[PDB]
């Protein structure tokens, strides 16, 4: 009746990528006792029975007492003349020098050991193993790579690594402490106006702490100094007050201050942040949080020599790896012989016929795109044509590359791209063997130039080999000198053109006097965003007035996209404007490291901007974007790498995230080589931090293996059983070793001490994320947080969060440092692996659902709208109450605007959270720029229920009409516009992230959502009203 008795005959009720194999090959967690064949110098095989967690000291010391009961005993030296070795799962013969290591921790492939004495008598140097571990592929895997570029990278990048370690031991040990513990400081000293007014005309109250003996007691010297006084001054006032006395004249104090003053430096109580240079205390982040949060700083006087005590000497060592012919001579068009793909996996039934579409490109393309005929279609596909490209060979730009793809009848099968010049500047000539890459999910488009340059290293893939026209000699690219001449010639040649011209658009005819309408159509273009595509008229317009455009530095990004790169005439002149163009702000410069600016002069310039302007603070903000932009660099060795590597080696807090951002993407073979090499270099030069990173790595690996077992074997068991298993395993010593003495990668300032397994637990989600809880082992744990806790989540792709939480952080600092205070809580989050990451826990906050499960009464009738307000009142009572609403009203307002602008997945009772103090903030954002509309809008994802509206207007009825809400509604307008004025950045940030394989960022139209939602094509008054309209129609009343 229901189904018209239609049977579905097929349907039968019978019927997080993974898997990183663990302690032994094919098994996650090696059996608690196990058998291992020890192999001796005398060819004898004992077979020791060994505990999972026994050291090699324990195994050797025993093996040389169980080999005494086997033959040929006197053919073996004293054990100390020996060392273990075996095959690993990465598949190298690893000599086991650290005999304090445990058998589970070795990553053996099969359970066996072999004795030897150590060859390669520089033992020290065969701790490349430390770097190999940190990186998760062995350094010898690079020694075996043929390619000159890779080896030329490895040797030449050490130039940078050297100059970095120079800058560290310059004014040591201070300069060393500076590297290790850089001051955490806002880039502006100016203190925003709403922060000021929490100060009674520029005064904080601080609290210095001290210790005398044994280490036991401490003492609180509570100052009240000027917000804009420095650590030095503050160290004095503390020392004054410690040592005033009735047994001391005033002038006697002054001397006993001077001699003590600079024997001390300012710690922060609870974490390894230190105030180590001339900065107004306001400017240090810890302070500026304490102001905002209604908190009294807790600093500490630490003796410089008790700190310089701790810093070990980096000890940087150099490794064991210690005529042309101008392109412009070449007279012909480009041609390229195709030949034959082999491995082409297609149905001859379903699909008709197949060809090799090709093209030449520079980001966007400099000729008509061509193909070959649809030959030996499907079965054994072989062409042997010569594709003829209608660009003359002198008219190639430095950056240009062939893009190709095998298509069907009609949609693409496989793709691959090659750099037309090698890294030595040399036109590519001869035969090539190019293995293809599959087409991505979203990519319907036939050819794919934004994809990575180079062959796939996966052998078993469509190997489309081909030939390049060869001109009897190595064809290089012109010198700069040679390019300057041709620019000056093309300039003088242009001066004597004649009155009229067929397309006098490219040329002026106004000459040194341009019309006043024209000079302000340029600044009108100048202002427009990156995504507003430019009309040919306008390009030729810009391109003509190009020399006036030096007045308006910021115009450049446009100007470059105006040049035709198919005219070396034009291109050569551009190389000379750009040569010495005015440097620009970093926010505009970063546009010029995206895929659309592939030239090296351009990209050099853009680094020259960062070198000058971009600060270690603002670098650390945008690090993600700059590491992602490495993927668009043509060659391994380049200016951006040399910059980032150096900053990383200068500053150990950047260094830290620089490792993890690269290490994060090491699974992804499009960058496995590149990033590997870079990490190797960083790891060799960063000195002792390597050892700190090696513990963090070690820890994350144990956690990966743990959750892996939980998500495969131990599913279909009760939480109860799983939770036994978890604790049982954390008990074991290889774990207690591995998971206790280390730094949080979410922020390496926090230490992670012993694990309280009381508070460690598996969350309820089906991905089985772990709630881990460590002791803060700081001396002043008390004054920060005695227990540190963070969530490890194997199974989910963090990096969409990682970006949105970054974007939010930026919107906050935009808003707040423009004086207008909307408090966003961009909780910490870090991707460290395939779908592996970390999330900062925020204590004392609950999902609105929890609020309603609490305040729900007795018998399950219906939940109340006020419950939230009533739970929020129970927390906040007095002048307190009014302030808890202000906070709520302010955060709700920011999170309204941010959510809407980004279009992040719809918000509901289970992904909005509220704090005891009454701040509201979103978690678990999903897909960001409206990824779910690929299924069939301009959405409002934060739709303010009654609940919020009530709490917004201190508990009224028909709340939409109060003044309380007029404030709120104004904040939303003031916040929406404030972003809009910075909407260039937000385009550029999203624009730089296309290099990642984030499915929400496939290509520029994805990003184009953010235009309509900021309404950039309009004027501002229109946007306001569009925003009001969009806010009105989701809520059904309120916004005029």
């Amino acid at each position: 009746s229901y189904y018209h008795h239609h049977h579905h005959h097929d349907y039968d009720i019978p019927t997080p990528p993974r898997p990183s194999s663990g302690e032994l090959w094919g098994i996650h967690l090696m059996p608690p006792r196990i058998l291992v064949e020890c192999l001796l110098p005398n060819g004898m095989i004992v077979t020791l029975e060994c505990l999972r967690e026994a050291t090699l000291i324990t195994i050797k010391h025993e093996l040389f007492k169980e080999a005494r009961k086997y033959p040929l005993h006197q053919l073996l030296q004293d054990e100390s003349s020996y060392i273990f070795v075996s095959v690993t799962q990465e598949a190298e013969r690893e000599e086991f020098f650290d005999e304090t290591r445990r058998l589970c921790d070795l990553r053996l492939f099969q359970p066996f050991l072999k004795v030897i004495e150590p060859v390669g008598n520089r033992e020290e140097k065969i701790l490349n193993r430390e770097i190999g571990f940190a990186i998760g592929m062995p350094v010898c895997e690079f020694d075996m790579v043929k390619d000159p570029e890779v080896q030329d990278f490895r040797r030449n990048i050490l130039n940078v690594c050297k100059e970095a370690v120079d800058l560290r031991d310059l004014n040591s040990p201070h300069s060393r402490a500076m590297y290790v513990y850089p001051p955490n400081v806002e880039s502006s000293p100016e203190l925003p106006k709403h922060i000021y007014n929490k100060l009674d005309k520029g005064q904080i109250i601080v609290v210095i702490w001290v210790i005398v003996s044994p280490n036991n007691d401490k003492q609180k010297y509570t100052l009240k100094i000027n917000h804009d006084c420095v650590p030095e001054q503050v160290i004095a006032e503390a020392i004054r007050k410690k040592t005033r006395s009735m047994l001391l004249s005033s002038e006697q104090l002054k001397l006993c201050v001077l001699e003590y003053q600079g024997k001390y430096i300012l710690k922060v109580c609870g974490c390894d942040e230190y105030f180590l240079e001339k900065y107004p205390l306001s400017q240090y982040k810890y302070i500026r949080s304490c102001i905002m949060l209604g908190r009294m700083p807790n600093l500490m006087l630490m003796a410089k020599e008790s700190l310089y005590s701790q810093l070990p000497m980096d000890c940087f060592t150099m490794p064991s790896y210690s005529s042309t012919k101008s392109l412009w001579v070449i007279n012909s068009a480009l041609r390229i012989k195709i030949l034959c793909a082999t491995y082409v996996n297609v149905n001859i039934r379903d699909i008709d016929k197949i060809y090799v579409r090709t093209g030449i490109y520079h980001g966007g393309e400099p000729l008509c795109d061509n193909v070959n005929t649809q030959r030996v279609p499907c079965s054994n596909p072989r062409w042997n044509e010569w594709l003829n490209y209608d660009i003359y060979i002198p008219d190639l730009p430095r950056a240009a590359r062939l893009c190709l793809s095998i298509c069907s009848v009609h949609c693409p099968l496989a793709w691959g791209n090659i750099n037309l010049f090698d890294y030595t500047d040399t036109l590519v000539s001869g035969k090539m063997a190019l293995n293809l890459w599959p087409v991505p999910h979203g990519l319907e488009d036939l050819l794919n130039p934004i994809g990575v340059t180079g062959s796939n290293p996966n052998k078993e893939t469509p190997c489309l080999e081909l030939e390049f026209d060869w001109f009897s000699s190595v064809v290089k690219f012109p010198d700069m000198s040679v390019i300057e001449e041709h620019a000056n010639w093309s300039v003088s040649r242009e001066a004597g053109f004649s009155y009229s011209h067929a397309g006098l658009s490219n040329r002026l005819a106004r000459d040194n006097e341009l019309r006043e309408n024209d000079k302000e159509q340029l600044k009108a273009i100048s202002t427009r965003d990156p995504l507003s595509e430019i009309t040919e008229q306008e390009k030729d317009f810009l391109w003509s007035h190009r020399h006036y455009c030096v007045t308006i530095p910021e115009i450049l990004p446009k100007l470059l996209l105006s040049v035709k790169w198919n005219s070396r005439d034009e291109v050569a002149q551009m190389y000379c404007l750009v040569k010495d163009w005015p440097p620009i702000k970093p926010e505009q410069a970063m546009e010029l490291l995206d895929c659309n600016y592939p030239d090296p002069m351009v990209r050099g310039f853009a680094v020259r901007c960062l070198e000058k302007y971009l600060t270690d603070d603002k670098l650390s903000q945008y690090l993600i974007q700059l590491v992602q932009v490495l993927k668009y660099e043509q060659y391994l060795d380049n200016l951006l790498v040399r910059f980032l590597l150096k900053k990383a080696l200068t500053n150990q807090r950047i260094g830290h995230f620089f490792f993890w951002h690269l290490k994060s993407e090491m699974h992804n073979k499009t960058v496995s080589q590149r990033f590997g090499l870079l990490l190797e270099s960083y790891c060799r030069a960063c000195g002792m931090y390597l050892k700190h990173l090696n513990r963090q790595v070690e820890a994350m690996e144990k956690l990966i293996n743990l959750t892996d077992i939980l998500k495969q074997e131990k599913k279909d068991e009760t939480q109860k059983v799983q939770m036994k298993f978890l604790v049982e395993q954390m008990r074991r010593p290889d774990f207690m070793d591995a998971l206790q003495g280390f730094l949080s990668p979410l922020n390496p300032a926090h230490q992670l001490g012993n694990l309280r397994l009381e508070e460690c637990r598996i969350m309820s989600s089906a991905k089985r994320p772990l709630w881990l809880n460590w002791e803060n082992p700081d001396i002043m744990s008390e004054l920060l947080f005695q227990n540190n806790e963070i969530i490890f989540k194997n199974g989910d792709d963090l990096r969409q969060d990682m970006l949105t939480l970054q974007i939010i952080r930026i919107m906050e600092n935009i808003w707040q440092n423009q004086g207008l205070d909307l408090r966003m809580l961009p909780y910490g989050c870090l991707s460290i692996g395939d779908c592996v990451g970390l999330i900062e826990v925020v204590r004392n906050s609950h999902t609105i659902m929890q609020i309603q499960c609490k305040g729900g009464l007795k018998g399950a009738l219906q939940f109340n709208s006020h419950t939230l307000h009533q739970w929020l009142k129970d927390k906040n009572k007095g002048e307190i109450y009014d302030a808890a609403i202000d906070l709520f009203t302010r955060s709700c307002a920011g999170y309204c605007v941010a959510t809407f602008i980004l279009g992040i997945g719809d918000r509901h009772n289970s992904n909005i959270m509220v704090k005891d103090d009454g701040q509201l903030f979103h978690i678990d954002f999903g897909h960001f720029l409206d990824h779910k509309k690929k299924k069939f809008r301009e959405r409002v994802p934060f739709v303010l229920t009654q609940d919020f509206l009530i709490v917004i207007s201190k508990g009224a009825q028909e709340c939409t009409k109060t003044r309380e809400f007029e404030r709120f509604q104004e904040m939303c307008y003031k916040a929406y516009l404030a972003i809009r004025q910075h909407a260039n950045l937000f385009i550029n940030l999203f624009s730089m992230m296309l290099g990642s394989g984030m499915p929400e960022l496939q290509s520029f139209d994805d990003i184009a959502y953010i235009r309509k939602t900021l309404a950039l094509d309009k004027t501002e008054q229109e946007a306001l009203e569009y925003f009001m309209k969009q806010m009105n129609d989701a809520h059904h009343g309120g916004w005029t």
Binding site: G43, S86, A91, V346, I351, V439, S532, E536, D540
Partner: protein
């Protein structure tokens, strides 16, 4: 004058010569007295500037919007599922390939050990002649050593076959992706044209 007359300009330029502040704009291979005057003429744009070929029910055209959308989004899952298999297989494959290299290297250490003992043992087979006591137990050890290398090459072989069975299944996955892909584009192209024929009624469409 209302066939050819930014974001959804490009979405209707996707995959196809094609053409379509305060006047008008002409877009694929952007261009700023009358409107229908100038487009019929160019339908070669070289001679203007150095460097235009392709221009009843109501409620059961919208049930076809529900139907082609159930096809498409089932068809998309078919694509989205297989892409994962394709990658997992790729992954799993390579782990095997490494294991083979590791197996291989395991063997080479063991083959050398069966070699290593004979040098040092068949010096002690001849010196003194220990008698049948010493050499029956140096014979026992060597018995294991070889029968172990048997086991390893058994284990490696047994892997190498599986590589092929995976590798076989790998190819088969791409095979079917590449047949599903082209139909997926037309299922998608027609569901855009079907919704274009409907559009105002913007707000009635989300349920289908």
């Amino acid at each position: 004058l209302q066939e050819w007359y930014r974001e959804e300009v490009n979405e209707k330029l996707r995959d196809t010569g094609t053409f379509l502040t305060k006047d008008y704009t002409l877009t694929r291979k952007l261009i700023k007295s009358s409107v229908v005057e100038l487009i019929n003429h160019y339908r070669s744009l070289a001679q203007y500037n150095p460097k235009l070929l392709y221009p009843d029910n109501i409620e059961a055209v919208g049930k076809k919007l529900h139907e082609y959308n159930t096809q498409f989004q089932e068809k998309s899952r078919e694509y989205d599922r297989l892409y994962e298999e394709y990658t997992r297989t790729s992954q799993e494959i390579q782990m095997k390939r490494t294991a083979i290299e590791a197996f291989n290297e395991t063997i080479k250490i063991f083959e050398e050990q069966c070699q290593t003992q004979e040098r040092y043992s068949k010096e002690y087979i001849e010196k003194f002649k220990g008698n049948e006591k010493e050499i029956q137990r140096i014979m026992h050890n060597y018995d294991k050593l070889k029968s172990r290398i048997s086991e390893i090459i058994d284990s490696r072989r047994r892997l190498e076959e599986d590589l092929k069975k995976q590798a076989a299944e790998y190819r088969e996955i791409d095979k079917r992706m590449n047949s599903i892909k082209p139909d997926l584009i037309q299922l998608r192209k027609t569901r855009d044209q079907y919704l274009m024929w409907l559009t105002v009624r913007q707000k009635k469409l989300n349920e289908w």
